[PDB]
Amino acid sequence: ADIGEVAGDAIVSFQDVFFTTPRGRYDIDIYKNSIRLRGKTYEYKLQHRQIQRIVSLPKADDIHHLLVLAIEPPLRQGQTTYPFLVLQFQKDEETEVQLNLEDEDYEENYKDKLKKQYDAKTHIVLSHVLKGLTDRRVIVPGEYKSKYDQCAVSCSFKANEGYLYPLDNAFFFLTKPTLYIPFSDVSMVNISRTFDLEVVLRSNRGSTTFANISKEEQQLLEQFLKSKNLRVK
C-alpha cells in the first residue's frame, strides 16, 4: 500500500485527491498521452482519449466542487465497473504549479493546450489541464435553476438517495450509481409532499425514475424540461 515513488516525469500531479467514485484517495499524475491514478490499494492508467466527457459542477452541499469524467472503457475495481469517475475538491482549495515541461516542448506542442504556470482553484486547474490534453469540452451547469437557485434537486434512484442535475442537454445523477442521460435519449418524462420523475427512454429501453423530488420543485423542473421540448405529463 505504498502509493509509489515520486512521479518525477509527470507534467503535473495532484496528490491525495478524494474520489467519490470509485471511493478512495488517488494521486493523479498527468503525462503527455496518459494519466495515472495511484492509490494505496488500486492503480490505473488512462489514455487521454479514454476520457469521453468532462463535467464540472458545484456539489449540492455548498462546500465542494466535483469533476466527473466519463471513461470508455470503464475502470474496473474487482467485479465492479465504473464508467464515471467522480472527483471532489473543496470549492476554494487552490493549486499553484509550474508545469514540468521544457520550454521548447511547451512552445512546439502545448502552448495552445496548457498554461506554463497555473494559480487557481484546484478544480479549475485540473479541468483546464484535462480539457487541454483530452480535447473534450467541459460541461457546466446550464440554465436550470431550482426554486432556491440550486443546480440540482435531492431524490432517490432505486434504494439510494442522491442529486439530480438537469443540465442543458442531459440528466446527471450521482453517486450510487452515477448516471448521465442525454435529453436526445428521452422519449418522454412521466411525472407523478414529493413527486416522482420517470425518465422514459426512447425505443422502449425502459425508464429511470428519480423518486421523491420535493413538490416545491415540480413546476420549475417542468418548465425547464418543457423549454427543451422533451415530453412531460
Side-chain angles (χ1 to χ4, degrees), residues 1-31 33-39 41-78 80-103 105-107 109-130 132-142 144 146 149 151-175 177-192 194-203 206-215 217-218 220-221 224-225 227 230:
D2 290 1
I3 292 169
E5 305 312 305
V6 59
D9 297 343
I11 294 173
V12 56
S13 293
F14 296 82
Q15 297 206 277
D16 192 41
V17 177
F18 190 112
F19 278 65
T20 48
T21 303
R23 176 58 78 88
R25 293 279 182 161
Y26 292 85
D27 280 25
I28 304 177
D29 304 321
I30 298 180
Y31 295 89
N33 297 126
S34 69
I35 297 152
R36 293 186 184 279
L37 305 179
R38 301 200 290 164
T41 307
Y42 309 97
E43 64 186 16
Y44 306 93
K45 177 180 185 196
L46 294 47
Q47 301 297 309
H48 289 335
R49 68 185 181 284
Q50 172 169 13
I51 292 167
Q52 313 281 262
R53 196 184 313 272
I54 305 171
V55 194
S56 178
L57 311 157
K59 201 178 169 173
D61 69 359
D62 184 50
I63 301 159
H64 298 96
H65 198 93
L66 305 172
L67 294 184
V68 181
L69 309 175
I71 53 169
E72 167 57 35
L75 166 155
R76 187 193 63 82
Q77 201 163 90
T80 307
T81 294
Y82 294 96
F84 307 93
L85 309 183
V86 181
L87 291 62
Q88 178 178 285
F89 299 93
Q90 299 183 301
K91 69 184 169 188
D92 294 322
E93 67 181 281
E94 298 183 345
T95 294
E96 181 185 359
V97 65
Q98 174 169 331
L99 300 199
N100 176 32
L101 287 170
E102 235 56 44
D103 291 334
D105 193 11
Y106 178 86
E107 287 301 317
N109 300 120
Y110 298 94
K111 65 177 169 63
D112 286 342
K113 296 173 175 132
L114 304 176
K115 304 192 187 201
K116 289 185 145 276
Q117 282 176 38
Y118 286 94
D119 190 356
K121 293 173 193 299
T122 299
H123 73 85
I124 295 175
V125 178
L126 178 57
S127 67
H128 191 277
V129 169
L130 293 176
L133 292 171
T134 69
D135 290 313
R136 309 308 189 199
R137 304 173 46 247
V138 177
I139 294 158
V140 297
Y144 172 81
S146 50
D149 273 76
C151 298
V153 298
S154 175
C155 63
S156 63
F157 172 71
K158 299 181 193 175
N160 292 305
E161 280 184 83
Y163 278 90
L164 173 71
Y165 292 72
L167 296 176
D168 279 338
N169 294 108
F171 292 107
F172 176 68
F173 178 88
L174 79 168
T175 77
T178 299
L179 299 170
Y180 186 92
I181 303 167
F183 291 160
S184 71
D185 271 26
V186 177
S187 227
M188 44 177 323
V189 175
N190 298 119
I191 287 204
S192 70
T194 63
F195 78 97
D196 290 1
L197 186 105
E198 179 186 19
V199 176
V200 186
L201 300 180
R202 287 163 74 83
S203 306
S207 51
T208 291
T209 296
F210 301 108
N212 299 337
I213 299 182
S214 289
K215 232 209 84 189
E217 291 290 352
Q218 173 173 208
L220 275 187
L221 189 63
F224 173 77
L225 291 178
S227 84
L230 268 175

